[PDB]
């Protein structure tokens, strides 16, 4: 049955190699997805600053409306 055991160890060795090939592919997409995520966080972070800058302007302008409004 050495024949049997051998044909068995070969099958499991072939599958272990197959597994590492998939691991590589999986880890590659992950890296790809990760880089894509860091890029969108950057792009969105800039959007957030522009939004915050807009809140600051609105704040400044409302003081003027308040100043004007009172002066009536």
């Amino acid at each position: 049955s050495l024949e049997e055991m051998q044909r068995r160890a070969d099958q499991l060795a072939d599958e272990s190699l197959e597994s590492t090939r998939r691991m590589l592919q999986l880890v590659e997409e992950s890296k790809d997805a990760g880089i894509r995520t860091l890029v969108m966080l950057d792009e969105q972070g800039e959007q957030l600053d522009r939004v915050e800058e807009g809140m600051n302007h609105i704040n400044q302008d409302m003081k003027e409306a308040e100043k004007n409004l009172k002066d009536l």
Partner: protein, 65 residues
Amino acid sequence: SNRRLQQTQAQVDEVVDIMRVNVDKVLERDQKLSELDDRADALQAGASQFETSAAKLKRKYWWKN
């Protein structure tokens, strides 16, 4: 050997732990953004109305700069 396999497995469980935390943080980001999207939309609606009131007010007190 396992001298490298167990090492690799270990460094995977860590990146998994770190990412599950990150996923928890982006879900907070998700809720905050959802709230801000509501707030900024009300804000645009409220500013729009204020601009119409001001326009009327300026016509009413047309001698005021």
